[PDB]
Symmetry: none
């Protein structure tokens, strides 16, 4: 019924990551048009235009709702749409979640990945794939995501966890400087 906080000025998509993953924020369908100015719209139809301008074989939806946009409008472009709901309560995606994600992508064309804004859960799962499936260093993975989708993963505990699993936890980068659209404030209307 109502649009997510920090979404309106959140950039729509990142660059393709290592020619395999396209990170993006959630699409919002026409049913939200009254709540979103023309210059701030991000309909599924927009995604398919950019792709048409490489084929995205799969879109992975990491959000916990199906109220943002109609999945059919992704599938009617021949894009397999899969939901992958991760552990909640602010937790890092689990060992199960990553195994599910990695096995999912293994069947592959670009792979689209989105959570609400396209940074934290999206970056985490992409970085896990790059390390586990492609033998990247976690340093290259995190940095590559940050370049493709600035500022990249910015949730400190997520960065910490990725280096605990795949590197030395002591080496995790500090949370990056945040862009103007990205801020935490419980009183912001």
């Amino acid at each position: 019924n109502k649009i997510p906080p920090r979404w309106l000025n959140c950039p729509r998509r990142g660059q393709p990551v290592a020619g395999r993953f396209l990170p993006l924020k959630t699409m919002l369908g026409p049913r939200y048009d009254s709540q979103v100015a023309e210059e701030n719209r991000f309909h599924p139809s927009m995604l398919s235009n950019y792709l048409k301008s490489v084929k995205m074989g799969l879109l992975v939806d990491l959000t916990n709702t199906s109220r943002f946009y109609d999945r059919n409008d992704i599938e009617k472009e021949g894009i397999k749409y899969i939901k992958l709901q991760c552990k909640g309560h602010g937790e890092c995606p689990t060992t199960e979640n990553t195994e599910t994600f990695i096995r999912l992508c293994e069947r592959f064309e670009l792979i689209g990945v989105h959570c609400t804004h396209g940074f934290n859960r999206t970056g985490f799962l992409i970085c896990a794939f790059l390390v586990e499936k492609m033998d990247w260093s976690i340093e290259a993975a995190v940095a590559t995501f940050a370049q493709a989708r600035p500022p990249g993963i910015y949730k400190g505990d997520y960065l910490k966890e990725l280096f605990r699993r795949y590197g030395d936890i002591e080496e995790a980068p500090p949370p990056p400087l945040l862009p103007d659209w990205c801020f935490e404030d419980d009183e912001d209307e």
Copy 2:
């Protein structure tokens, strides 16, 4: 007063349902609380989670103590009818602080201190959840007006309203202003209701 206008796109705030209603009176002077929500939101709030203005004034009558003033630090009038506070003889004042996640400014703090130093009667203070902006302003007052140490003020708020201020930048800023920035505590352990998650 937005409380009496369309509720169509009026959802209750995130993390509010299981957020504790009120802390203990801090130094017998300030009562921190989360925002009240009026009867208009009852269709979205289970009976056991409700916190109407009437609930606060009922608690005050139990304490056998008058609240002289309620300082509302939120940026909206949609949550409850301010008159439900004012009709009880409590002065109601909105104090809108700097946004974009910033610490209350030197202006904000001066405004708060001058408002309160006019008020034995309690002063209520709430933001959305009653921890970060509420705690910051109460701590600044305890230090600037009552000559407390910032260590004492921060710990007192945390005892009265656990976990206290938990926003790390807000803790660091209070120690920058009023102590030694190196002695600032790290953010505290968070209770189950209190978590950050964009997908929840």
Copy 3:
């Protein structure tokens, strides 16, 4: 001191070399050398990269380039004034030749220049190897990046990034452990030449 206006051939492997990478860490813009209008009879319009193209992109992004560092050993490709007239400081930094990685002196010189500065442009002839190397040295030395992050960031911004294997090894030799150096990527398709053509 400016051979652009006196009397050659365009550099080899340049025509289909990509013009520019994405801004690296919001600080550096790597590119291949520009070629001025004098070379237009040797370059089809869809392959031209005049200095004006760079400044048209800089106006497009609504971002100012403060400095352009030119790592080539000639002034014949474009008029440096074409850069300087846009308010962009121009400096040539000639690194050690004959295949050598840029020296510590070269990198120290590069870092000194950049400290003054807004994007910083960096080009060699093609904008991959010496360009990549110096950008990566800065990121590690001045911004305390890991070399892994630096090398990978440049590869994402300007794929495949540094593709000389010994440049990659040397950077790891200087800024990490030489054993952790990633292997050289495949030679880019735009490097391809038919030896009988």
Copy 4:
């Protein structure tokens, strides 16, 4: 036309390119293009490879070259008469350009040319600019089509005689596609050190 006597740079990646391979199967001698004395001001004495140098080696072996196949697209590098005056038949075979593998036409042409140097005759010399890719490709096609070698044996034999052999991956792939199984094609070897160029020189 003979551009050797007209107007001018030496080919890139040539100075340190090895002059000649070992004879392949006692039948083919792969080499880089010769450069005539016209180019001596651009080539240090220690790097010179005049036609006369090829002749001196052939005498050193006490063996005759019946035929030299030139796969380059120019006559400017050396005077073909410097070959012919020695009793060696000279033939230009220009293959498809634009990075393409020698075609089915090219290979047929090469095979028919060479099968006369068993039939009416000795080594057959073969050169492109550097003597690895087109040179190797055609030699290997001949070995397979005419001498019934496996493509594995042909490609390995060429790599042994003229290391690292054919080093362009598409050429290797295409030979396995025609004459074996494409999935058995070896990956490209390392780019030879003599190919190294500093782009800022």
